[PDB]
Design an enzyme around this catalytic site. Structure first.
Site, PDB file in Angstrom:
ATOM      1  N   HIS A 421       0.838  -1.198   0.000  1.00  9.52           N
ATOM      2  CA  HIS A 421       0.000   0.000   0.000  1.00  9.52           C
ATOM      3  C   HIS A 421       0.876   1.252   0.000  1.00  9.52           C
ATOM      4  O   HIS A 421       0.685   2.157  -0.830  1.00  9.52           O
ATOM      5  CB  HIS A 421      -0.946  -0.001   1.211  1.00  9.52           C
ATOM      6  CG  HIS A 421      -1.671   1.299   1.436  1.00  9.52           C
ATOM      7  ND1 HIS A 421      -3.003   1.477   1.124  1.00  9.52           N
ATOM      8  CD2 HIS A 421      -1.251   2.476   1.964  1.00  9.52           C
ATOM      9  CE1 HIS A 421      -3.370   2.707   1.445  1.00  9.52           C
ATOM     10  NE2 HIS A 421      -2.322   3.336   1.951  1.00  9.52           N
ATOM     11  N   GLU A 422       1.849   1.295   0.913  1.00 12.09           N
ATOM     12  CA  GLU A 422       2.718   2.470   1.029  1.00 12.09           C
ATOM     13  C   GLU A 422       3.567   2.653  -0.227  1.00 12.09           C
ATOM     14  O   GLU A 422       3.859   3.778  -0.632  1.00 12.09           O
ATOM     15  CB  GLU A 422       3.614   2.368   2.269  1.00 12.09           C
ATOM     16  CG  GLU A 422       2.873   2.170   3.602  1.00 12.09           C
ATOM     17  CD  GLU A 422       1.787   3.223   3.883  1.00 12.09           C
ATOM     18  OE1 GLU A 422       0.898   2.941   4.713  1.00 12.09           O
ATOM     19  OE2 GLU A 422       1.807   4.327   3.299  1.00 12.09           O
ATOM     20  N   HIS A 425       1.856   4.700  -2.729  1.00  8.28           N
ATOM     21  CA  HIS A 425       2.067   6.143  -2.582  1.00  8.28           C
ATOM     22  C   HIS A 425       3.365   6.620  -3.257  1.00  8.28           C
ATOM     23  O   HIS A 425       3.410   7.707  -3.833  1.00  8.28           O
ATOM     24  CB  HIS A 425       2.091   6.530  -1.101  1.00  8.28           C
ATOM     25  CG  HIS A 425       0.753   6.460  -0.432  1.00  8.28           C
ATOM     26  ND1 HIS A 425      -0.356   7.125  -0.908  1.00  8.28           N
ATOM     27  CD2 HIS A 425       0.354   5.825   0.695  1.00  8.28           C
ATOM     28  CE1 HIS A 425      -1.381   6.901  -0.106  1.00  8.28           C
ATOM     29  NE2 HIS A 425      -0.978   6.114   0.873  1.00  8.28           N
ATOM     30  N   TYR A 463     -11.646   2.102   3.132  1.00  9.68           N
ATOM     31  CA  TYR A 463     -10.568   3.052   3.374  1.00  9.68           C
ATOM     32  C   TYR A 463     -10.182   3.792   2.088  1.00  9.68           C
ATOM     33  O   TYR A 463      -9.696   4.933   2.130  1.00  9.68           O
ATOM     34  CB  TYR A 463      -9.337   2.355   3.968  1.00  9.68           C
ATOM     35  CG  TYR A 463      -8.251   3.341   4.335  1.00  9.68           C
ATOM     36  CD1 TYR A 463      -8.433   4.233   5.389  1.00  9.68           C
ATOM     37  CD2 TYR A 463      -7.056   3.402   3.626  1.00  9.68           C
ATOM     38  CE1 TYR A 463      -7.454   5.158   5.727  1.00  9.68           C
ATOM     39  CE2 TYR A 463      -6.063   4.328   3.962  1.00  9.68           C
ATOM     40  CZ  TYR A 463      -6.272   5.203   5.014  1.00  9.68           C
ATOM     41  OH  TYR A 463      -5.306   6.121   5.370  1.00  9.68           O
ATOM     42  N   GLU A 470      -5.303   7.821  -1.218  1.00 11.67           N
ATOM     43  CA  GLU A 470      -5.547   6.545  -0.558  1.00 11.67           C
ATOM     44  C   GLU A 470      -6.238   5.558  -1.498  1.00 11.67           C
ATOM     45  O   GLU A 470      -5.982   4.365  -1.437  1.00 11.67           O
ATOM     46  CB  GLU A 470      -6.390   6.736   0.716  1.00 11.67           C
ATOM     47  CG  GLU A 470      -5.821   7.727   1.730  1.00 11.67           C
ATOM     48  CD  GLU A 470      -4.435   7.365   2.221  1.00 11.67           C
ATOM     49  OE1 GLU A 470      -4.075   6.174   2.200  1.00 11.67           O
ATOM     50  OE2 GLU A 470      -3.692   8.279   2.613  1.00 11.67           O
TER      51      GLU A 470
HETATM   52 ZN   LIG Z   1      -2.053   5.454   2.637  1.00 10.77          ZN
END
Ligand SMILES: [Zn+2]
EC number: 3.4.24.83
Length: 513
Positions: A421-422, A425, A463, A470
């Site tokens: 997930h990170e 980004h 989320y 996100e």
């Molecule tokens: Zn995030």
């Protein structure tokens, strides 16, 4: 004899105990029993509009508050809500369960500053959250200075070692909540249908990489083993070394000096009163001896991955910021996390993005201290109200990915998914940078993706609805899941996102060097 052992240890510390000043005793009590924030004073200081906001806010929708902060705010919310009528109250609870909608901007900016006013004065928690790095700018300066004062004074109180007579003649005990170490394994370590039993497979996960432990705060241990409470499935049994410093506390306890290391001797499932517990046998050793093992592991994991990613051998990419009781697992699971990462993501994407991060002196930080106390965050995030705690974070200013081992990610099966997930980004960052290196923005701030978010933003995870960045990151995570079903949902439920992300990946891989 339990009672003779107690008496003999109390006698060993009897002069010490008699010699304590009143300020000495007060400090020891404050260490044991933290000072809570005054709810009434907090509430009285809110405006009428802020009180309203707090009444109706969905606290667990927050993605930046710690567990402790969240728990306090919920209590605060109870008081503010306890003048409303029962229907209002029942509605407010009914709405919270059936929906995890994201926080409004108004709601978010309010919670971020309120954060400053809800901190307890808790010396042992401060030490654990910072791993002893107590100058970290994550709390008010003046409070910071009081902590340092108190901690220096406690260090000086705890000057008497257990000694060469007692050290190999006594065990000490500590009952522990498994969530304190792994919220992720904690959720499953008890057998789903028979909670008198431990999940054997999860137990193996917990045990396999548990070789050493660090205490950065002051352990409070029982002289005599205490029967477990509700949340306590871990039962530590500890051997001190002759030079371990400690003090006696009433009711048959010792407080140990901070900064000690523990070598794990044995980890076993045991039975006490027809219920299963985890016995942990540990021996105190110099903390320096454990720090050496950690630094060697950091050297090794960088050498291995620098070669795999084609980086210069000396590149400092991976950092272990490790200070707490599950230390060796933070270290070892990093290997597994990065394996899954490389397994699930195209090699050229990983290499292109990581080189970009390295170009900005970025890091992969694996830590067991809270993210506001990590320099790759706080050096670029001066405002405590902007500081974030969570399972993970990407910080563009430092081109760094941070991953917090002890906590459990929202709707994430494991730490590997949280890293990916990170990394989403970071992809977002590099993609945007390749559009315009000068005024470097995020590709999720392009109007095209904003248009895509407005259409498909609610079609993946709850989320993912939070915002463009996100959503992209969640989409990116699901597109690279070990589970084919999850890859397919993105392609089927968010086809424009799916296409947009694959296009960025091509754009990145095709940019020339
Ligand atoms: Zn995030």
């Amino acid at each position: 004899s339990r009672y003779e052992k107690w008496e003999k240890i109390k006698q060993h510390y009897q002069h010490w105990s008699d010699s304590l000043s009143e300020e000495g005793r007060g400090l020891l009590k404050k260490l044991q029993i933290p000072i809570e924030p005054k709810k009434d004073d907090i509430i009285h200081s809110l405006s009428q509009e802020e009180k309203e906001l707090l009444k109706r806010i969905q606290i667990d929708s927050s993605d930046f508050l710690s567990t402790e902060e969240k728990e306090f705010l919920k209590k605060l919310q109870i008081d503010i809500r306890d003048s409303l009528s029962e229907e209002e109250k029942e509605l407010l609870n009914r709405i919270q369960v059936d929906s995890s909608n994201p926080l409004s901007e108004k709601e978010k900016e309010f919670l971020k500053k309120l954060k400053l006013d809800i901190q307890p004065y808790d010396i042992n928690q401060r030490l654990q959250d910072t791993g002893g790095l107590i100058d970290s700018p994550s709390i008010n300066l003046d409070v910071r200075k009081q902590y340092k004062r108190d901690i220096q004074n406690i260090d000086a109180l705890l000057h008497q070692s257990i000694g060469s007579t007692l050290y190999n003649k006594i065990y000490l005990y500590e009952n522990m909540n498994i969530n304190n170490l792994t919220a992720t394994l904690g959720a499953d370590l008890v057998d789903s249908t028979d909670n008198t039993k431990i999940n054997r497979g999860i137990f193996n996960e917990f045990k396999k990489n548990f070789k050493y432990s660090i205490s950065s705060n002051y352990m409070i241990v029982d002289i005599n083993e205490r029967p477990a409470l509700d949340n306590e499935r871990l039962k530590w049994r500890i051997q001190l070394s002759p030079d371990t410093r400690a003090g006696y506390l009433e009711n048959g306890k010792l407080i140990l000096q901070r900064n000690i290391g523990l070598e794990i001797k044995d980890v076993q499932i045991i039975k006490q009163s027809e219920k299963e517990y985890i016995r942990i046998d540990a021996k105190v050793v110099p903390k320096s001896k454990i720090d050496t093992k950690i630094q060697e592991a950091q050297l090794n994991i960088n050498q291995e991955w620098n070669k795999a990613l084609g980086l210069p051998k000396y590149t400092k990419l991976i950092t272990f910021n490790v200070h707490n009781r599950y230390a060796s697992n933070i270290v070892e699971s990093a290997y597994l996390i990065l394996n899954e990462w490389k397994n699930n993501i195209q090699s050229d994407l990983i290499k292109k993005v990581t080189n970009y991060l390295v170009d900005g002196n970025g890091r992969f930080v694996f830590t067991d201290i809270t993210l506001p106390n990590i320099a790759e965050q706080y050096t670029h995030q001066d405002e405590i109200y902007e500081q974030v705690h969570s399972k993970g974070l990407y910080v563009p200013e430092s081109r760094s990915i941070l991953l917090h081992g002890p906590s459990k990610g929202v709707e994430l099966r494991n730490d590997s998914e949280g890293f990916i997930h990170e990394f989403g980004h970071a992809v977002d960052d590099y993609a945007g940078y390749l559009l315009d290196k000068n005024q470097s923005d995020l590709v999720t701030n392009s109007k095209k993706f904003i248009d895509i978010f407005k259409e498909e933003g609610s079609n993946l995870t709850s989320y993912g609805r939070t915002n463009e960045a996100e959503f992209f990151a969640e989409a990116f995570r699901l597109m690279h899941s070990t589970d084919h079903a999850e890859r397919l949902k993105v392609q089927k439920n968010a086809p424009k996102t799916f296409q947009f992300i694959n296009d960025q990946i091509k754009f990145i891989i095709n940019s020339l060097v």
